[PDB]
Nucleic acid binder design. Sequence first.
DNA 1: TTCCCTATTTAAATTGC
DNA 2: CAATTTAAATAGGGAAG
Lengths: 81, 81, 289, 295, 289, 295
Amino acid sequence: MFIRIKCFSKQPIAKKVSREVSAYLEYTGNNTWEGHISGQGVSNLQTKLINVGKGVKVVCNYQDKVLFAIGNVAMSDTGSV
Amino acid sequence: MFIRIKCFSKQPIAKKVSREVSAYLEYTGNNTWEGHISGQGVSNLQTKLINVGKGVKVVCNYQDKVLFAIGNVAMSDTGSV
Amino acid sequence: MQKQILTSQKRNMYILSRCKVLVKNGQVCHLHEDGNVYTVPYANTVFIGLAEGTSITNEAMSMLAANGVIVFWTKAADIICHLPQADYRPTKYMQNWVRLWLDEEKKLSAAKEILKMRVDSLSTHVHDFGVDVENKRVSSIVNKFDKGVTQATSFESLLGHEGTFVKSLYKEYALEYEIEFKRDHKSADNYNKFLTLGNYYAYGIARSSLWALGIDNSFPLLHGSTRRGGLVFDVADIIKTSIILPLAFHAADQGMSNTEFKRSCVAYFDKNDILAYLINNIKRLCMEN
Amino acid sequence: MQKQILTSQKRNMYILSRCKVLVKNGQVCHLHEDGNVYTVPYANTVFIGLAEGTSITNEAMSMLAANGVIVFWTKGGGYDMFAADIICHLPQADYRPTKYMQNWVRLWLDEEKKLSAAKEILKMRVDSLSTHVHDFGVDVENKRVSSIVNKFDKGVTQATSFESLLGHEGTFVKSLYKEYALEYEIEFKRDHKSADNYNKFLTLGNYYAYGIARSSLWALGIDNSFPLLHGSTRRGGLVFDVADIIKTSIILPLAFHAADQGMSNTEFKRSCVAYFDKNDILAYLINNIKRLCME
Amino acid sequence: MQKQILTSQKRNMYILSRCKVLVKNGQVCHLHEDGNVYTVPYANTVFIGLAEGTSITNEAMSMLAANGVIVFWTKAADIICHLPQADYRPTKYMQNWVRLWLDEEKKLSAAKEILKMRVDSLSTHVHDFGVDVENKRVSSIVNKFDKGVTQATSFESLLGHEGTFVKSLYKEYALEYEIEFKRDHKSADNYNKFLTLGNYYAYGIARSSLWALGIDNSFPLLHGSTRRGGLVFDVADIIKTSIILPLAFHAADQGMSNTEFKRSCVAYFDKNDILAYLINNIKRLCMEN
Amino acid sequence: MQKQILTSQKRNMYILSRCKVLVKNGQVCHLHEDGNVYTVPYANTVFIGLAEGTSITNEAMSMLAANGVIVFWTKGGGYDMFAADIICHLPQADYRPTKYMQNWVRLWLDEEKKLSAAKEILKMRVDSLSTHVHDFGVDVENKRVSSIVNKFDKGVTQATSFESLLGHEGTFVKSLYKEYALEYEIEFKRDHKSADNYNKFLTLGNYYAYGIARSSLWALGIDNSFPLLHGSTRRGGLVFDVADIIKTSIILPLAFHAADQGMSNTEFKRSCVAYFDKNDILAYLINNIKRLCME
DNA sequence: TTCCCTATTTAAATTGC
DNA sequence: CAATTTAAATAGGGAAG
């Protein structure tokens, strides 16, 4: 199932997020992991993202709708910074 | 048609491709443009990013597609970098 | 340079609150938070509406109004908009529409054809929930007001007759979505705030359906003593009471914030091509001769 | 800086350039980039115009919509319109149409006084040449100018077909370009595709006169889509009609003097704006449309 | 804690050439000869099928085999695949697999199911254009493969049953999409080098169906002179005739490169869940008892 | 450094530690991190293992698999594997399960031979206790230990059902745990979740016991899911069913005396691989499974 | 691989306009 | 309105074990 992960976090947490999501998705460029995970895989990916702890800045995308988002500062209708 | 631009170019040409694709899409992750658009607008982007000058490196991804890929430094085979 | 992408496939729409709209790096923007500058896609943007504490400068206006992207303002009520004018819009629509529109019988026919389009707005857009397409009450009330605009005795007979439709849909959507709110522009609850902020989606879609194709708005339809604003509310209420009111009652019922509500209406506009519908919907009234 | 333009009887078109317009003490005032705030009058104002660098707010717009004004955005020189609201009878009590297209397209939907309005508007093109004078270039009181005024008066009066009218207009344009060229001791022919300084100053002046058209029609609620001489399929043909009143009269010698003495485009725009504000050209176009309207 | 996705939940894949599958911050990255490291999705990879010039690191092999991504060597007679062994596979499926391999009447049925799963992959993975899936020239070849595999009287009887199917598919794809390339391994072009790094990708989604769900490559479904390579080659031949050779033929007809063919094969295996189909299809024949 | 470990009659299992593997002069060689290059023998080598720090090129892989060497991957020390192709008779011309697989599935599918193989593998558990003697821990030739051995022998020879054999194995492991605990005079009770040093050390030794068991079953190319004592749904029950030969006689004294000293887990790993090499126990498990299969 | 550079690509912020 | 800075910023590298 076609999901997409972008990481907006800071180092060294961003390398940890790269290690967790890079086991599940292939990396495209400037932190937008892209590919296909089944829904239980997204659920356990959410579980290890929770077990990463605080400081995670990840917004997922199932097409246009946000499938999940752990940690945020400002994310309006558009999603720009 | 939800299409998705990801740029990879540089510092100075990235500002011009920002000014000519954020006119047509919306910046979400670090370089990952996305948003709803027309195929006529797709042809217009292909024209104005031919006419941006040499040195751009942009691949569009309408869902799971490689719609236009102008410029390439190194794509690591199957959908990666 | 370019064919300057047509407004009937423009694909973005925005309301901003507490910002400073300007040009940064050739790009019209948001300033929603303190230092959070966003980007507005002017080749897809239908409209930019501006809440309290907001302002747009002239460089954003000049970059914006070059392909048919308006600005109106929030503070139903008195609203001054800004349609693009330096773009010489096509003439045949407004030639034929003044040709009907001087004659009060043909102006009345134009009003009865744009006022029957509440059912068409409920017909080409069907993916709803809760009351869904029909709760055996919304189809009835839109049918009787279709007949009420089918009669159409005079313009001042229907000056505030649509206000009964909007208030009966406010209290018709609330008998199944349990709250007892009423229409107030200063009420702090979620229902009035969402249903007021959705009128500022409807106004933007209507004025950008008039700006690109050619009608300057203030030559009004449904004029009188209460319906103030012009033909825009005669086009905004096409998608208000049929499109934005169910999503507003959804977002006030599920109880999430304003941004994801605006995402829901942005998606509902984008997947159904609603200003595309409003461009060739009033062209069947404008170009018709 | 606030700059004024007369339209009908009172100076009411204040143009704001490079300012932050916001609510000061429950009233609309504008803070310029120099750091000084100035207020705007209210009962003296029906039109209010925002040039480059101008930012207005929403609560200010709410008061401006609450107590009776219409606001518009504008380009360089504060005169060239690009984004505007529209004019009604009164924006608060009853939103009813302004009477100027009532008179004008009542007289246009029948052919005979539409043709009368066409010959009247070529008559005020003649009056634009004969009335408005300059201190340089072609004098409007010589033998050739008075001869072509008499020839055009005859050629406007006897005719009943719009093809003869547009042929007379093209003959006037070519002939007046020839006499203006031999006054500057050169031989020239008009071409939009040529990129010389003389042709491009003519084209920029034509675009700015299109701006004076669109502004003078916005001041009455008449719209840019309603030509009298050019056909109904021509986009913005009324703008090319009302500008042709002035494009042979004031834009032409100003642009020809700017091309002869070799200034740049921006200062030629500034000189055109100074002539437009000093000799109330917009107000004369309002007077022209108002006497063509009520008959 | 960290239950992880199964091999029937892994959709990414890779068939790396001139690479170096090393350890880079815990991620198994296939670093090609250009100087960049393709970070393979190690937990979601079916396999990383190595080609000439590839050196798989030991810790990278540990991270690949622990997450059920069994790396293989491609450069078929001699293609040895290192199946994962520390994470113990399904014991209920593997115990009944030998009971359906030792009994010759049951070995015939297990071989018939494992070779008729190719017919079940040309109808499930329906992402086959050009030669189609119901064009009666490739569908006829799949039906002939199913007819040959339906009897399956011995492992040495229909030992080269997949070879005739692959030859028929490669002949029909060339006769349809204007080509004449035969079944060769050293005919260096854009066609025979497409279905030699595409069949290695078909062994990519086969080494994850025998390292977690299925039993082993030792007990194969086809044994004989032309049946050397293992049961991984009998699990790859289910996906070779439907997702490898049609994608290679489409990339050769469209003038695509080998990298575009690899991306097309990986995306067609991910979208159709071909690795998941192989993992859940090996468990059907093995755990039938 | 490279290590030689006996499988059947020649040192045909090679453990290749930290290096790089590549083709040099048209033959498979390997290059350590100290700068010394070594080639491989080919008639001597049938099995080659790779530990932490190695990488092998594909040309070396194809040349090793081309004429009769099967490669495998493993943890540190070579006595826990994670990646391996599975053994055939000749890996190139033929591909079929081995004759060890053949006789093993014949004894697994025959119920009387199933019970006979269960009795015989407990009899080899007797022979492993009587064979592997250690200077630490209990003595296998005293009264109490050999009395429990005789009780186990009477238990297996007088049993018929599988659950009786499981109960005999249960009282064997609790009895052996009791006398080993009495040897160092601390009371124990077995529980897998006990987070103390003694129980976690015994589970680590058990882990390397299942590793040497898995290396033994892969050395004959027989799979991991055909157990003799545990049920058919036990997760890797055959690995435990060959490992319990070594847990009751080798892993328990080594782990228990080493956790009496309480030294580190990595040095325990090194000493366990050293004892596995010196006692040459992997070949003893090949001898055990060969006398089960050949009967 | 954990780790530390370290060239980079990169923004958005400055900033005339 | 783009005219460019400065970094928020990652694999991409060497070691290492």
